Amino acid sequence: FYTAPSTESKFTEVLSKAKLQYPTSTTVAFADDLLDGYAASYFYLTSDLYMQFQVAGSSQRSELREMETSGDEAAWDCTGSTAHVASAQIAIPVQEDGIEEVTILQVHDSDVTPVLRISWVSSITIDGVTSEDVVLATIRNGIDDSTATKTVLQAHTTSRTEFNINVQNSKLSITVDGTTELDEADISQFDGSTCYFKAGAFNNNPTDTSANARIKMYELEWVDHHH
């Protein structure tokens, strides 16, 4: 009894350029399935026209993964000359009790390393400064280094917020409601990797493994701009 995100033309292009993974990394719906009206409790259109992702459990996800229209997985040069841009209007609801971090947008390499995660966090401490109820950027320092550089981007609001990720040459920038909050962070540690975008809800380290993480997107797109 769920309405499909494909019923809204604002999502046609991104769905044509995506596959949906749930609840782990296995694809449940390819682009053709998504365009044919795929809908489930974990991926549906709300009455006010948001594409909503919902998932329970540690490190589980309901996430779109960037694809080419040819059916090839997106695998662009992480630090190449072509700009790659992901834009999303996201409303992050107050999360259920026991949900502690939800990743909403990623730049991921073609193996096992997230270049960037944008996530909501109940709390975070960075260089001795603790922030609560914020949206955070996490950039991994290397494939062989589990540590990351973390940057608070925004105090959490339930209001629809524009997020824009721009990746070009060895630099990555993030704008939030038009304001640059991460200005040309270095990602040269991914030279010689390939990359793709992801968007949705990816539930990180919950304290209640039965609680549902929930993220809503009013607009979503990923594009290339050729130098």
Ligand SMILES: O=C(O)[C@H]1O[C@@H](O[C@H]2[C@H](O)[C@H](O)[C@H](O[C@H]3[C@H](O)[C@H](O)[C@H](O[C@H]4[C@H](O)[C@H](O)[C@H](O[C@H]5[C@H](O)[C@H](O)[C@H](O)O[C@@H]5C(=O)O)O[C@@H]4C(=O)O)O[C@@H]3C(=O)O)O[C@@H]2C(=O)O)[C@@H](O)[C@@H](O)[C@@H]1O
């Ligand atoms: O807690 C700490 O100590 C540190 O945590 C750091 O952040 C963590 C996060 O908390 C998450 O755990 C995050 O999880 C990553 C995970 O490390 C892997 O990168 C994994 O990669 C999957 C891909 O997203 C993708 O879904 C892929 O799909 C493939 C798959 O092969 C599929 O079967 C099919 O064949 O093809 C598809 C495809 O489309 O390419 O599968 C990958 C997989 O192996 O599961 O996904 C998550 C993720 O980010 O999505 O990891 C970070 C981390 O950096 O380790 C950080 O906060 C740090 O500061 C802390 O100290």
